[PDB]
Symmetry: C3
Subunit: 627 residues, 3 copies
């Protein structure tokens, strides 16, 4: 019933939207006709978008294959994404506009204008530059959500040194593996972070990792908690001590890099035992994050924007830092969690900063639904004009709860589908589309999405199949670091199209619904995990011979992990062992990837080539639906 209902947009949004203005300028009033034009005229569209940014040197060609399926956008353009986030606003009124509204776990707070971020980034860039960081060097970042995280990312960008951010919830093995895969040369971290009134010991974990990372030449430490932490002479140095000798008027000019020079690497979990470094580049990634931010979230000059995702994930890269800053938004940056000091924290933040756009995750919404409708009703949320969700299916009851309690039964919900590999939102409503609960809606301009069978034939309306995209888009990953074969499988699993690894349906009006992954990827509480990487993290333990990890449905977390463990012969299979195996995973990989359930078995299903048939494991537990 409820999923098949259409909700028309509120008053005043359609006539005023950014998408409407761009549509008009090309002669359209209807999204469907404009969309069809966008397929036939994709270069014109992306040229128009690219022209709204600053280029050091113009491009020759919008798009081209290099060695299919590798490609490029804005060939020979010289660019720096950091110039479009900072420098180009200097000497204009935007310099005094707030860029980041920082909000600490404990309720402390501080606002940073574009000018202040410009100055702070310049000075951090100088510190990195004096240590020997230069274009092409990888800079690892393991930080809590504080202004110096944002400044470190943009400082790397202005130097042309690709950043490699590791989410602060990962433990030492996870951190070590990511820095060794990409050969990071320096690490930027903090003494610690706060989550729910407790200290997270980032520096201690960083030590455990850096001891087994031979390329790390220096560790820079933000003094955030102020606790006494160990500091190796020579290697480890406090940022504030170095910044003391860097004047307030210091300028490091942006490095004019090629549009195809690396911006960052972000490790994502996949179908192998090792995470894959997705590589994004300055030019096309900037243009895509810019355009999607502008049209989906309808950014205007007076908007305060808040995306609740951590910067350690793609959503925080694209839609907390780069896309919003390129639209000159005022951006909320929050260090803490939804439930501390109490479960109305998000609604305090919205009221305090008069947030206009909130982009959050269903995991947060399902969490807060448990605490009742009274909590958000205690705050003034009338500043909100657009809501958004990302990362997983939002079930209809949560969508209704969101729209009712946070949106006063009026506000649109932008349910955005995309992935780390895609760089930008690809399938999503805009403010002009009528909404269906649980649907990501129609593709964005130029995005040629479809649902096909294993051979590439359209399955037609209302049938399930594989979600594919038929033509590159500017923000797509350009390679997987050190592993181009892994990149090619994305375009060569189904001939000539990009394979998302998601099941989907398209209904009679063209609205897409994403069912979930067709491979070994498991989403727990919003976080992407790989079955085979979890298995590895258990097989490392002396007690364990083999392991199979599956996802099981969970009301709060979406999925939880269960692992079937074969122990070495003779090992007594106890509750104490289960606790110990969970600790092993929690202290090496991190809490986010700790199994909730473990079961000890004496055999597992295997193909003849020795691989674990995970589908059979899951089917034995849960059954397999026919088709």
């Amino acid at each position: 019933l409820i999923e098949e209902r259409l909700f028309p947009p509120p008053e005043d949004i359609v006539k005023n939207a950014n998408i409407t203005a761009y549509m008009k300028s090309k002669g359209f009033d209807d999204y469907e006709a404009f969309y069809r034009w966008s397929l036939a005229n994709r270069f014109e569209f992306w040229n128009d978008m690219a022209k709204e940014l600053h280029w050091f040197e113009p491009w020759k060609s919008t798009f081209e294959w290099t060695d299919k399926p590798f490609f490029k956008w804005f060939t020979d353009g010289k660019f720096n994404i950091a110039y479009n986030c900072l420098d180009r606003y200097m000497g204009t009124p935007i310099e005094d506009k707030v860029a980041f509204y920082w909000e600490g776990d404990d309720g402390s707070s501080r606002a940073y204008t574009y000018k202040e971020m410009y100055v702070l980034t310049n000075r951090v860039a100088k510190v990195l530059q004096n240590q020997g960081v230069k274009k092409g060097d990888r800079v690892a970042i393991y930080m809590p959500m504080i202004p110096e995280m944002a400044a470190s990312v943009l400082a790397c960008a202005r130097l042309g040194a690709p950043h490699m951010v590791v989410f602060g919830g990962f433990a030492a093995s996870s951190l070590r593996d990511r820095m060794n895969d990409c050969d990071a040369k320096v690490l930027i971290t903090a003494d610690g972070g706060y989550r729910g009134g407790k200290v997270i010991e980032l520096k201690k974990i960083a030590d455990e990792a850096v001891a087994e990372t031979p390329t790390i030449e220096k560790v820079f430490v933000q003094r955030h908690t102020g606790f006494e932490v160990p500091m190796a002479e020579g290697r480890d140095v406090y940022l504030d001590v170095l910044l003391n000798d860097i004047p307030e008027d210091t300028v490091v000019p942006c490095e004019p890099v090629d549009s195809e020079d690396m911006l960052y690497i972000l490790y994502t979990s996949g179908s192998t035992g090792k995470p894959k470094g997705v590589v994004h580049v300055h030019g096309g990634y900037a243009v895509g994050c810019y355009a999607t931010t502008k049209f989906v979230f309808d950014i205007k000059p007076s908007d305060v924007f808040w995306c609740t995702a951590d910067i350690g994930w793609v959503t925080g890269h694209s839609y907390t830092i780069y896309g919003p800053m390129m639209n000159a938004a005022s951006i909320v940056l929050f260090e803490g969690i939804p439930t501390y000091p109490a479960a109305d924290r998000f609604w305090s933040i919205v009221e305090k900063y008069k947030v206009n756009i909130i982009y959050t995750a269903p995991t947060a919404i399902r969490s807060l639904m448990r605490f009742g409708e009274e909590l958000p009703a205690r705050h003034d949320l009338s500043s909100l004009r657009i809501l958004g969700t990302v990362g997983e299916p939002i079930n209809p009851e949560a969508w209704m709860w969101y729209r009712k309690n946070i949106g006063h039964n009026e506000l649109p919900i932008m349910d955005t589908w995309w992935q780390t590999e895609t760089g930008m939102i690809l399938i999503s409503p805009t403010p002009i589309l009528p909404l269906k609960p649980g649907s990501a809606s129609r593709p964005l301009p130029t995005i040629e999405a479809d649902v096909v069978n294993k051979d590439g034939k359209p399955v037609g309306p209302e049938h399930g199949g594989f979600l594919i995209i038929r033509h590159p888009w500017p923000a797509q990953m350009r390679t997987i670091f050190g592993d181009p074969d892994r990149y090619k499988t994305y375009w060569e699993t189904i001939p000539d199209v990009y394979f998302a690894g998601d099941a989907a349906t398209m209904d009679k009006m063209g609205y897409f619904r994403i069912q979930g992954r067709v491979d070994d990827v498991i989403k727990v509480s919003g976080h992407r995990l790989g079955s085979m990487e979890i298995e590895s993290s258990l097989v490392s333990h002396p007690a364990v011979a083999e392991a199979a990890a599956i996802g099981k449905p969970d009301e709060v977390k979406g999925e939880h992990v269960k692992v079937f463990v074969i122990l070495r012969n003779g090992v007594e299979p106890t509750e104490s062992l289960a606790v110990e195996l969970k600790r092993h995973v929690r202290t090496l990989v991190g809490p986010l990837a700790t199994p909730d359930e473990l079961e000890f078995v004496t055999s597992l299903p295997k193909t003849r080539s020795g691989k674990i048939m995970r589908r059979v494991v899951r089917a034995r537990e849960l059954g397999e639906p026919v088709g």
Copy 2:
């Protein structure tokens, strides 16, 4: 599941039914074949029915168009419906049969034979006649459900003076508007009525209305409560004081009117800000109410019949007064409500009068379901042989509750579909049809119902569409008073067919299901309201600039009204204001039309011609289903 089950009729009803006997006399045993004959031979059918009543002069032609789409039945026949309800039973045994079993709110009671109603109607007709009432004059009636209401209606009928009954739950503006639209010359009312042990102040409300009704020359007041009420010298006079000088043997002969002379006007809420006076005429209306009563409720000489509807609505006109009296039934007339003194009141009444047929509303059933299965089980209900429901969809759980607790899992439920405009039941079971929960079943004889799209093409089994009727029937309204353009839209929205304004489905066996109105009509607790009339009743208030009224689903009431109100700039939008706006509506229009929910907004959706797009308002709140 449950809605798709077929329940065969009980023991002994099929062989004994009135419909079976009429079928046999034309050579049929199967309803489906008889029905098809009834379509090809509709004039024969209606002639047969008309011949069972008394005519002063016979008709020339069964049916004819005058100026299509106006038409007539029994042309040039001279008739009086009151003669078939009263006079023709005098000098026969039916004169001493009970006609009305009156039951007061407080449990007092009195039985009136056909002879006693004959005498009482004659005497009230004389009072009206001495005041100057004559054929064609409109007589307003605002009364509680007491015997003098029935006698006033039939007295008007015998004089040929169309009656205009205003339901006693309406307040002064509603009463004033109805009397001014039709230029009523006298008003018949009461000092007050009782509902749930409380006095309803009818005379006080009548004063407020009559002060702004310039055509009212006289107000006749029944002394029902006996409370001291104001009485303007000259205008207002007590009925009992006038009847004191009217002897017991007084006779006013029936006026032999044309079959097409006005019988009554009944204001119904529609798609405009003003209610519409549906005009019914003596001859075809009598014949239709007669035949439907006979076949659907299977009236026999020993039956006590009870329809729980108020006479202020069409159901009380057709199926409390005229149809039952023309079948010579003994009829229950109840002043009160289902829950006073306790929620077993209806079942006390059934047991007390050994009711054989009960025709009630789903609103009553849903109300009583709340109080448990114990209440009806405390009474002997074994006198019942037929149950009936009208006015709204009965959901399957309520149908089961009805059939189980009131019908001992045996009795048929006649789920009758019709409307004020149709005069008589059109789609309904008879005792010979197997029943489906929530289905109005097959059309009655001669009724050519179908489900079509906007152009008039059949949609075929199992698909939703517009319910239409293809050929007039005798009891249909002949016009809308003072507004023939409004009448014509009924036949010219879809070419050449009558458009009900209801959505419906027809299943594989021909059984119809009515989903609900496709226009701006809202049913609250059984009562028909118009969105645009509710809006008017708010816009009259100084605080309010504009309003949009929508229906929302409600478990007890079926729908409830919510109104979106735009206030004049500067008006503080408070809870006190909401209470005050509800009072404004309650004290002018009446409780039945008071909004349950009010929300203050600053804008509403409009077409370019300035009209309120109510569908968009509702869709924003509830969503719109696709199709």
Copy 3:
């Protein structure tokens, strides 16, 4: 959702299964292809199976019609089923293997090897032989589930004297009617049995029955309770007193009977007022019970097998005694009920005997589900490797409960469809088939099952129809005792096929689902009852003129019986009368057939030939689904 899920078999069962080995030996690895071969080569299949047993003389022809639709299998073969259950294991290691693990109601217990059962059966055969029992004589058996029941059955078999077992829950009229229909010559019974710590007075009931059974020449009484019971001189004699004079080395050789000589009669309830004696014969019945037991339950040398059914029903004949003993299994025999002394009794038994295969009824599972997941978790059930259910639909929630709590989310559930008339399982999983909850899966080898309309046309995937079998199978009944016309209706209701009297569906993969009986059969708590036999048991009472019995859905019992009773005129219809009528049924027929609900009516629906239209009775109560 849940019913459409496929659950693949666990680890190690497919490669080791008996069915896999037989398949391989004919050149197959896939069940579907093997199944098709089994249809084209049914005689080869059944010859292969028959060769695994001992024959005194070989057969000439696998199958032939005699007078279609009567037929025979293994024509002219000389055989004795008891030789394949006992004698042929003597002088081999199987002689010292446990045959029966007997477990008393009170927790007492005793194990009997194949040798001990051989000796005990021989000695009981001698007692029967000395009394004058010989080939063709009918021996009635009314016993509790004790070792002497098993020995009495096999002793009859070795003498060639057909047994007629009457379930110990039946009362005297039921017992008398079964013995008079087949002219039983002796009765074997007990002083009493125990159920839930209470004595069931079998001997007292046997007296009431034998007084009206003129052919009974002798009653043999097992001393089980040891209570003082009446003993008529001449007729009634204690078994233990006779066995005292029968030496331990006594041998009665098996009678080499024709493959088509009667093995037993088992009365089953049908569509007439009298139960029907289904006749099974030694040869084909042995071969079918042998093969189905081997392949469905995958019996191996180390298996302990437990079927919870009473031997008084077909499931206990085929799958407690004959099929298991012919596979040389160790078999659990339990006297008691699931809930005494507590509702973990079944799980105590599994743990105590390390049961490997459990074959039980949904009635037991639905019963135990009421007591929570804690009870089975208190016992070690890890010995189980196969679960099974029979006799009625198992709803998905019960299937899940079974698989989760008893099967640790791994074990296959063999949902077996068959009937008394079929002798053996016909539609069922084997260990190699992926399972669907609530589905009986695919037909077993050579069984040509299909779903057809009333004329015999296939209805095709996903449509409901009549379940039929197209070609005989070895264990099918050969006749109905004294009533060959009743047998012929099974093959002549739908031309040329066997009509099961069940509705069914076949899905896209060929998996069958059995909805239920299309006739007047009612299953209550696993027990097959006939509407018309229940009616008879009420009409016998002086108060009652007529009766109609229907089945109504019941959460615990599956169905319960409600009876509509017409009383003689003048009889006061009271609660005391209802109690008395239930007692009448309980004390003559038995508790298993006592109505839960009785309603007194004054008329019932009848055809013109005077028969009760039960479908109309049920439809009036519950509705009839359309189709």
